[PDB]
């Protein structure tokens, strides 16, 4: 599902990161406030999508790129997720981008089956505001609050030390256990 790990990612934990409401929040409603506007052609017609970036996402993503092998894994469709991530990931942090079709369908949910990834699950984390994405691996999860438009959010700032603590772990199940301890 994922390309072979690179030379530089060699010993790194693999962190799977969701897009909508975790890193960004999108809408069809025009706003003046928006960080990006992306044209998406819908059933062959063209819809402006207005995207707000979550506070600190740029610095959060940069640090993560220094510490982990970062993957984007979203249940949204590529035609949306690729341009939005292209503009969001202004430093090239994501090694891979997986979309709706790499998810499994579980009666109406799209689950991110971490075991299809080709990485040691003892060295994999998932960051996602929907517990339904991680039905099969809640023990690898680092939950995060949904975000929409709150400019005073500091959740990604709060989480940086957390991942800083985790980044050298040999088994995430032990580490998350001691973090929660
Ligand atoms: Mg989400």
Curated annotation (Swiss-Prot):
> What tissues has this protein been observed in?
Expression is restricted to non-neuronal tissues. Highest expression in pancreas and lowest in liver.
Binding-site residues for Mg(2+), renumbered to this chain:
18, 20, 129
**Catalysed reactions listed for this entry:** O-phospho-L-seryl-[protein] + H2O = L-seryl-[protein] + phosphate; O-phospho-L-threonyl-[protein] + H2O = L-threonyl-[protein] + phosphate
What EC number(s) does this enzyme carry? 3.1.3.16
Its localization reads: Nucleus
| UniProt keyword Phosphoprotein present | yes
Site positions (Transition state stabilizer): 74, 112
Where would I find the FCP1 homology domain in this sequence?
8-166
Extract one GO BP annotation from the record.
protein dephosphorylation
Q: What cofactor does this protein call for?
A: Mg(2+)
Active site at 18 (4-aspartylphosphate intermediate), 20 (proton donor)
Tell me where the transmembrane regions lie.
none
Q: List the disulfide bonds.
A: none
Induction profile? In primary sarcomas.
Give me the Gene Ontology terms describing cellular component: nucleoplasm
User: What's the record's note on cofactor binding?
Assistant: Binds 1 Mg(2+) ion per monomer.
Q: How does it assemble?
A: Monomer. Interacts with REST.
- Stated role: Preferentially catalyzes the dephosphorylation of 'Ser-5' within the tandem 7 residue repeats in the C-terminal domain (CTD) of the largest RNA polymerase II subunit POLR2A. Negatively regulates RNA polymerase II transcription, possibly by controlling the transition from initiation/capping to processive transcript elongation. Recruited by REST to neuronal genes that contain RE-1 elements, leading to neuronal gene silencing in non-neuronal cells. May contribute to the development of sarcomas.
State the name under which the record lists this protein: Carboxy-terminal domain RNA polymerase II polypeptide A small phosphatase 2
What stretch of the parent protein is included here?
Answer: 90 to 270 of 271
